[PDB]
Design a protein around this ligand. Structure first.
Ligand code: FMN
Ligand code: FMN
Lengths: 323, 323
């Protein structure tokens, strides 16, 4: 019925001359009298009305204004946090020995990378075992690259697309089995796909939920579409060229009832497993993929009609390779 | 020189009749007068001496006792949190609609699983696209299973072991390349291996750092060993039989200088990619693997001589398959 909000675990606070600092923002007005009790109260799970009844005492317009802002600013949340918010506090614990100019200079960055690729563990002793370089590895593994340019004219055949997604399907064989591992065998990653118009034979544009039990796509949304402004600038041409987008979504209901918060962590690992498994079948079918770290997931989540117990973990752009 | 402690982002607090509640524990004595200022002060990064100078005012033995306990209880920490602590607060946000008896009953669990494997997205419309089941998938992918019984007599040949780990090595080819994807191409997962005595041809028992630039093992620790009590009960026979253990470690210094906290999240995905990539080469070489979700990583971290900027993400047991 009514929405229940919690104090975000990712948000810590502090008093100021200016007001109450929560996260990276300072807040003003009534809220200064509300603390510390407001922090204690909000951790228990409370509605907006119960917050007003407990703290309003004065302009009820002025109180809704600061609550509206704590929801806007994600200090009060309705469900599990998406991964960006889960991890954000770790910035405050990592002491960075490099200069911030790594992020602003392709020349400073090119240097940081070559240094990290030649790193070694500090606690190493002066003994070594040189392994044999000779051995032969599967070509689907060794030739896989991050593909950022696709054939924008030839449609992905329905067979190729079907074959790609059968890597993620179920197999009934004395017991249900997948082609990839999963903590508890709970397989709590919901898989969704956005297909661009005319780019996949047999699949109208839209957002679809991949059902691994049927090996089917089930329509979710044909009204909205993904655009380039939903992508970080560095990725917009990748998206422009891609034929489809895969979205890996954690269903907390498929995991936390058994593993608690550790299941969310396990689902982040499982997201990698799925990406790697897909990326190998792709190379077999001369499909290219590119992982996307970040995107306007706030919008995608709304297009996919996700619930409080579902969050987007990862995204992948795909399509036929040129030539 | 001196150690600098931060208030753990994973820890929230509350006042009580009994005392100050921090995390799932209530604390007593001097600490009740120290709040709220102690919370504000500790977020900035402070030494033990500066804490004493600012709050002692009284029994300095009684103050070291509560600080010793806040460090023991991980309320005050020296670096990035390991994944279990990163995620733990999410339990407080997930509203569980199932009974807790899922965790205590193999019959309640067997039922929760079959229900989650037949789940569907709630926002689905009544349209479907049935994909072709026909397509053929690589056998290294389709036949891969979680292997929990190994040949404990035949040693993994040095060639097989070398070939397995070349999936994780670098390749100089106009530019440095790996066989698997990584955000920013920073490859911030340090790979370590524990080898049991007599179980891998050419590799003495011990902990080793895998250097992907040389394709070498570099000794870290031959004194300590992993034992069964370092494993969850459910996994102890898996470990007992395995020939070696792989540990995937996030080097925050190889990632956060560029991506901030998001690089830690990306490294959790990358851990999956690595596990899947390894698990495919393994199947090619008739090596079995099993992922381990949890283990006494507090001990392993010490055996690997990790620094504040390194945390263990995942573990894998491996060895030759029976017959
Ligand atoms: C992140 C992760 C953690 C896992 N942890 C464990 C574990 O602690 N113990 C275990 O026996 N298996 C573990 N597994 C293996 C799964 O139980 C297994 O993948 C699942 O039962 C499906 O079986 P399959 O690999 O044979 O398809 C783990 C898998 C993943 C992806
Ligand atoms: C978690 C993750 C996120 C990624 N995000 C992006 C991205 O946002 N943009 C991009 O161009 N590439 C992205 N990539 C691809 C990497 O940049 C790529 O794997 C790396 O440069 C190594 O190249 P290779 O795949 O050709 O070996 C991502 C990879 C991973 C594993």
């Amino acid at each position: 019925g009514e929405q229940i909000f919690y104090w975000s675990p990712a948000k810590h606070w502090r008093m100021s001359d200016e007001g109450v600092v929560i996260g990276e923002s300072t807040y003003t007005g009534m809220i200064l009298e509300w603390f510390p009790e407001f922090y204690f109260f909000a951790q228990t799970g409370v509605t907006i009305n119960r917050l007003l009844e407990r703290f309003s005492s004065g302009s009820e317009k002025e109180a809704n204004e600061i609550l509206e802002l704590l929801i806007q600013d994600r200090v009060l949340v309705e469900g599990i946090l998406p991964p960006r918010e889960v991890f954000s506090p770790q910035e405050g614990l990592f002491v960075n020995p490099y200069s911030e100019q790594i992020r602003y200079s392709k020349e400073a960055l090119d240097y940081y990378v070559s240094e990290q690729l030649n790193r070694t563990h500090a606690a190493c002793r002066s003994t070594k075992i040189q392994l044999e370089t000779s051995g032969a590895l599967p070509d689907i593994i060794q030739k896989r690259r991050s593909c950022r340019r696709f054939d924008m004219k030839t449609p992905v055949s329905f067979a190729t697309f079907s074959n790609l997604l059968s890597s993620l399907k179920q197999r009934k064989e004395d017991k249900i089995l997948y082609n990839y591992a999963s903590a508890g065998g709970l397989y709590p990653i919901d898989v969704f796909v956005y297909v661009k118009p005319r780019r996949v034979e047999g699949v109208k544009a839209g957002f679809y939920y991949f059902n691994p039990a049927d090996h089917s796509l089930v329509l979710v949304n044909n009204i909205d579409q993904v655009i380039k402004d939903d992508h970080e600038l560095i990725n917009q041409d990748i998206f422009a060229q891609s034929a489809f987008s895969v979205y890996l979504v954690y269903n907390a209901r498929a995991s936390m009832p058994k593993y608690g918060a550790a299941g969310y962590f396990y689902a982040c690992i499982e997201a990698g497993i799925i990406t790697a498994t897909l990326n190998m079948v792709a190379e077999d079918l001369n499909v290219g993929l590119c992982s996307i770290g970040h995107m306007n997931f706030e919008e995608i989540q709304t297009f996919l009609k996700l619930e409080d117990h579902q969050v987007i973990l990862h995204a992948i752009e795909g399509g036929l390779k040129i030539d």
